[PDB]
Design an enzyme around this catalytic site. Structure first.
Site, PDB file in Angstrom:
ATOM      1  CE  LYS A   1       5.656 -14.280   5.789  1.00 47.67           C
ATOM      2  NZ  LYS A   1       6.408 -15.095   4.977  1.00 47.67           N
TER       3      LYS A   1
ATOM      4  CG  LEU B   1       1.157  -2.659   5.058  1.00 46.19           C
ATOM      5  CD1 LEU B   1       2.909  -3.072   5.304  1.00 46.19           C
ATOM      6  CD2 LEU B   1       1.235  -1.444   4.008  1.00 46.19           C
ATOM      7  N   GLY B   2      -1.352  -6.300   3.419  1.00 47.57           N
ATOM      8  CA  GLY B   2      -1.622  -7.262   2.686  1.00 47.57           C
ATOM      9  C   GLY B   2      -1.927  -8.556   3.536  1.00 47.57           C
ATOM     10  CB  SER B   3      -4.128 -11.010   4.162  1.00 53.39           C
ATOM     11  OG  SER B   3      -5.003 -10.764   3.140  1.00 53.39           O
TER      12      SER B   3
ATOM     13  CG  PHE C   1       1.903 -15.634   5.455  1.00 54.73           C
ATOM     14  CD1 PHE C   1       1.730 -14.632   6.193  1.00 54.73           C
ATOM     15  CD2 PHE C   1       2.112 -15.491   3.889  1.00 54.73           C
ATOM     16  CE1 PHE C   1       1.779 -13.303   5.613  1.00 54.73           C
ATOM     17  CE2 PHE C   1       2.070 -14.160   3.363  1.00 54.73           C
ATOM     18  CZ  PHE C   1       1.749 -13.039   4.164  1.00 54.73           C
ATOM     19  N   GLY C   2      -1.069 -15.893   6.920  1.00 52.89           N
ATOM     20  CA  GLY C   2      -1.765 -14.682   7.737  1.00 52.89           C
ATOM     21  C   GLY C   2      -1.892 -13.387   7.209  1.00 52.89           C
ATOM     22  CB  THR C   3      -2.510 -10.282   8.351  1.00 55.49           C
ATOM     23  OG1 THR C   3      -1.926 -10.195   9.668  1.00 55.49           O
ATOM     24  CG2 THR C   3      -4.112 -10.512   7.927  1.00 55.49           C
ATOM     25  CB  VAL C   4       1.965  -8.179   5.569  1.00 57.48           C
ATOM     26  CG1 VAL C   4       3.206  -7.243   5.735  1.00 57.48           C
ATOM     27  CG2 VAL C   4       2.647  -9.315   5.123  1.00 57.48           C
TER      28      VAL C   4
ATOM     29  CG  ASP D   1       8.576 -16.724  -4.613  1.00 59.75           C
ATOM     30  OD1 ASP D   1       8.176 -16.735  -5.764  1.00 59.75           O
ATOM     31  OD2 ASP D   1       7.794 -16.310  -3.585  1.00 59.75           O
TER      32      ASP D   1
HETATM   33  C1  LIG Z   1       1.817   0.383  -1.551  1.00 57.72           C
HETATM   34  O1  LIG Z   1       1.476  -0.739  -1.073  1.00 57.72           O
HETATM   35  C2  LIG Z   1       2.447  -1.244  -0.327  1.00 57.72           C
HETATM   36  C3  LIG Z   1       3.393  -0.588   0.590  1.00 57.72           C
HETATM   37  C4  LIG Z   1       4.578  -1.132   1.104  1.00 57.72           C
HETATM   38  C5  LIG Z   1       4.486  -2.564   1.321  1.00 57.72           C
HETATM   39  N1  LIG Z   1       5.550  -2.794   1.953  1.00 57.72           N
HETATM   40  C6  LIG Z   1       5.973  -4.421   2.468  1.00 57.72           C
HETATM   41  N2  LIG Z   1       5.081  -5.322   2.345  1.00 57.72           N
HETATM   42  C7  LIG Z   1       5.436  -6.461   2.558  1.00 57.72           C
HETATM   43  C8  LIG Z   1       4.550  -7.739   2.195  1.00 57.72           C
HETATM   44  C9  LIG Z   1       3.179  -7.330   1.787  1.00 57.72           C
HETATM   45  C10 LIG Z   1       2.544  -8.276   1.503  1.00 57.72           C
HETATM   46  C11 LIG Z   1       2.623  -9.473   1.559  1.00 57.72           C
HETATM   47  C12 LIG Z   1       3.986  -9.755   1.950  1.00 57.72           C
HETATM   48  C13 LIG Z   1       4.263 -11.347   1.996  1.00 57.72           C
HETATM   49  N3  LIG Z   1       5.367 -11.703   2.742  1.00 57.72           N
HETATM   50  O2  LIG Z   1       3.914 -12.130   1.312  1.00 57.72           O
HETATM   51  C14 LIG Z   1       5.012  -9.194   2.218  1.00 57.72           C
HETATM   52  C15 LIG Z   1       6.646  -6.980   2.939  1.00 57.72           C
HETATM   53  N4  LIG Z   1       7.510  -5.740   3.513  1.00 57.72           N
HETATM   54  C16 LIG Z   1       8.642  -5.828   3.952  1.00 57.72           C
HETATM   55  C17 LIG Z   1       9.163  -4.590   3.873  1.00 57.72           C
HETATM   56  N5  LIG Z   1       7.961  -3.716   3.340  1.00 57.72           N
HETATM   57  C18 LIG Z   1       7.254  -4.648   3.017  1.00 57.72           C
HETATM   58  C19 LIG Z   1       3.609  -3.292   0.643  1.00 57.72           C
HETATM   59  C20 LIG Z   1       2.568  -2.555  -0.011  1.00 57.72           C
HETATM   60  O3  LIG Z   1       1.532  -3.433  -0.575  1.00 57.72           O
HETATM   61  C21 LIG Z   1       1.561  -4.906  -0.155  1.00 57.72           C
END
Ligand SMILES: COc1ccc(Nc2nc(-c3cccc(C(N)=O)c3)cn3ccnc23)cc1OC
Lengths: 274, 6
Positions: free
Chosen positions: A40, A15-17, A20-23, A132
């Site tokens: 996470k 989903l993202g990075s 800290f690492g990745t999601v 934050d």
């Molecule tokens: C359309 O794209 C998306 C659809 C859904 C999501 N959902 C979620 N993303 C993160 C998240 C993502 C990236 C970095 C970090 C972080 N800790 O830095 C947390 C945590 N979450 C907890 C519950 N749901 C989520 C994210 C999307 O894009 C990033």
């Protein structure tokens, strides 16, 4: 709080990075239903205990919270790496959503920012400081349901203090920080109200970055001169007035989340009636 | 650009 790696199914799609690492997206087997989750995962590149402690502290804050406008933690898992398992908010970050959906109505934006104020009213009542609070940290369940996330810099306040005093300045989201945070390293729920003002600006600007083109030091200089960001195109005057009130220089005269949520609640009902 | 170090 401890989950079973066998009951967790992770997707290959990330989903993202961050540093800290990745999601990653996944599904967790409950007593009967399967639950969609956001996980996470810590980077196991180089052995670093600082990232582990940060993730465990974040889990400890999330565990104490119970509100419809805050992301719920399912628990933690120790396997290929340390993992923090959360209930998935399917539509993702608010700034990215609004950047991709430029035809969202002002009534719908007010609805979402008011939901964030209800979550923040609860955190203030609970004596936790977020530290934050930004549009990137507001996650959407639906187009009409926002939740607060990312408790990475959050602190439980001491029973004898109304603020958290940071020992040393670190990598901080300076554009979202109040003058007492930059000048005295002091963080209170009123400091979070300042951040909420910036978050409102971002939401009415459809996810545009605040203080465009400026460095952290130039923003501090601008705020010290009594200057504030202008009203975004099409933003109601009452919402811009609220942003300016969140941007009260002196922490003692700045409103708390109870006053801010009430102001947003009454404006929302007025808009609903029209 | 978002997180600044001292
Ligand atoms: C359309 O794209 C998306 C659809 C859904 C999501 N959902 C979620 N993303 C993160 C998240 C993502 C990236 C970095 C970090 C972080 N800790 O830095 C947390 C945590 N979450 C907890 C519950 N749901 C989520 C994210 C999307 O894009 C990033």
């Amino acid at each position: 709080v401890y989950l079973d790696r066998k009951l967790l199914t992770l997707e290959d799609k990330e989903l993202g990075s961050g540093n800290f690492g990745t999601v990653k997206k996944g599904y967790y087997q409950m007593k009967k239903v399967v639950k969609t989750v956001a996980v996470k995962i810590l980077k196991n590149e180089a052995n670093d205990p600082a990232l582990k402690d940060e993730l465990l502290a974040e889990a400890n804050v999330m565990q104490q919270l119970d509100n419809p406008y805050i992301v719920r933690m399912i628990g933690i898992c120790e396997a290929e790496s340390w993992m923090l398992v959360m209930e998935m908010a399917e539509l993702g970050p608010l700034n990215k959503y609004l950047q991709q959906n430029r035809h969202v109505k002002d009534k719908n934006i007010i609805e979402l920012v008011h939901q964030v104020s209800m979550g923040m009213k609860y955190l203030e009542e609970s004596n936790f400081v977020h530290r934050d609070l930004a549009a990137r940290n507001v996650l959407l369940v639906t187009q009409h349901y926002a939740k607060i996330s990312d408790f990475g810099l959050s602190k439980a306040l001491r029973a004898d203090e109304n603020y958290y005093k940071a020992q040393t300045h670190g990598k901080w989201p300076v554009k979202w920080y109040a003058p007492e945070c930059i000048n005295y390293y002091k963080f209170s729920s009123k400091s979070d109200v300042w951040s909420f003002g910036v978050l409102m600006w971002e939401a009415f600007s459809y996810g545009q970055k605040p203080y465009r083109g400026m460095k952290g030091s130039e923003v501090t200089a601008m705020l010290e001169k009594g200057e504030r960001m202008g009203c975004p195109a099409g933003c109601p005057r009452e919402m811009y007035d609220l942003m300016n009130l969140c941007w009260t220089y002196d922490v003692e005269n700045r409103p708390g989340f109870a006053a801010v949520e009430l102001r947003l609640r009454n404006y929302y009902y007025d808009v609903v009636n029209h | 650009e978002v997180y600044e170090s001292p």
